[PDB]
């Protein structure tokens, strides 16, 4: 049961509530994408069309080792890849 804080910025605007993803036991990036896209829609009314028409739409994993992985919400070549969720420190979701 690992908790990971995340933030959402859309058109530069970032709501200030403290939000976590709750997941050791690896998961597919697809599982993270589903939750990220659903919360983009649930929290800021971001649609598939908004994502497709933005200049950029990504989420960045900051890992506990200090490395940062950028995942494209338009194209996720790593969708079927796996990642240890316990290695993630925070996630910055950004659409603009």
């Amino acid at each position: 049961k690992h908790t990971v804080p995340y933030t959402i910025s859309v058109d530069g605007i970032t709501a200030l509530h403290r939000t976590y993803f709750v997941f050791n036991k690896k998961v597919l990036y697809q599982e993270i994408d589903s939750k990220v896209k659903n919360e983009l829609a649930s929290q800021r009314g971001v649609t598939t069309e908004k994502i497709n028409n933005a200049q950029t739409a990504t989420y960045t994993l900051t890992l506990n080792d200090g490395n940062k992985k950028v995942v494209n919400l338009k194209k996720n070549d790593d969708a079927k890849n796996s990642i240890d969720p316990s290695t993630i420190k925070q996630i910055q979701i950004v659409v603009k």
């Binding site: 804080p5 933030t7 530069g12 605007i13 970032t14 709501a15 200030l16 509530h17 403290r18 939000t19 976590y20 649930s42 929290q43 800021r44 009314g45 971001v46 900051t62 925070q90």
Partner: protein, 218 residues
């Protein structure tokens, strides 16, 4: 709150912590014994039955007998738009009435339509992050800020700390902005990250909603 100071214990007895799974996620303001006021985005699509409304708190890391805890009975909203965070205000009816005492008191609100000008001195507060990429505060923080209109929508109250990087941060949403003893704002969003020193912080403008608030809380 980034760049602020610890508040005196129970200095602001209307200050509320909203918690999920024993963790603070948003602030709120006690506005009647059985009603709190927060940001709509705080509760827009969450497990409402699990939300704990914590009154009379100061240090979230200690056991505190001063606390009164309630559940959310009903959600009242007024034209909330999550796309642009417009009308980012909710009134939450509690499942009971608080006992008013030294540590739990209701806030005073402005008159409908009252607008604050550039330069008015206010106080922000909350249990949000103490820095960027930080963790929740233990102790309630406060911060001297100034009302500004540059880079601010007419549908918001915006504030800035001039001359240094300080401001509200994650976990501060829903918390009151106090201006001359009255609650003029509910913390809503930032631009350019927390404490940018560039964009002002944005608050839901309480004075635009007072007639509606009054119709609910009597």
């Amino acid at each position: 709150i980034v760049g602020g100071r610890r508040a005196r214990p129970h200095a602001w007895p209307f200050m509320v912590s909203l918690q999920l799974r024993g963790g603070h996620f948003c602030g709120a303001t006690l506005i009647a014994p059985n009603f709190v006021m927060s940001a709509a985005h705080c509760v827009a699509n969450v497990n409402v039955r699990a939300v704990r409304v914590v009154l009379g708190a100061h240090n979230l890391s200690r056991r505190e007998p001063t606390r009164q805890v309630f559940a959310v009975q009903r959600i009242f909203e007024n034209g909330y738009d999550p796309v642009n965070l417009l009308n980012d205000i909710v009134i939450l009816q509690l499942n009971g009435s608080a006992t008013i005492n030294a540590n739990v008191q209701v806030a005073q609100l402005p008159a409908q339509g009252r607008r604050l000008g550039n330069g008015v001195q206010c106080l922000a507060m909350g249990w949000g992050l103490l820095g960027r990429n930080r963790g929740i505060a233990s102790v309630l923080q406060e911060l001297n800020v100034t009302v500004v209109t540059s880079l601010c929508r007419r549908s918001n109250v915006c504030t800035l700390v001039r001359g240094r990087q300080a401001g509200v941060c994650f976990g501060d949403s829903g918390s009151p902005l106090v201006c001359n003893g009255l609650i003029h704002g509910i913390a809503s969003f930032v631009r350019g990250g927390c404490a940018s020193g560039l964009y002002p912080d944005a608050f839901a403008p309480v004075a635009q909603f007072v007639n509606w608030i009054d119709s609910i809380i009597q």
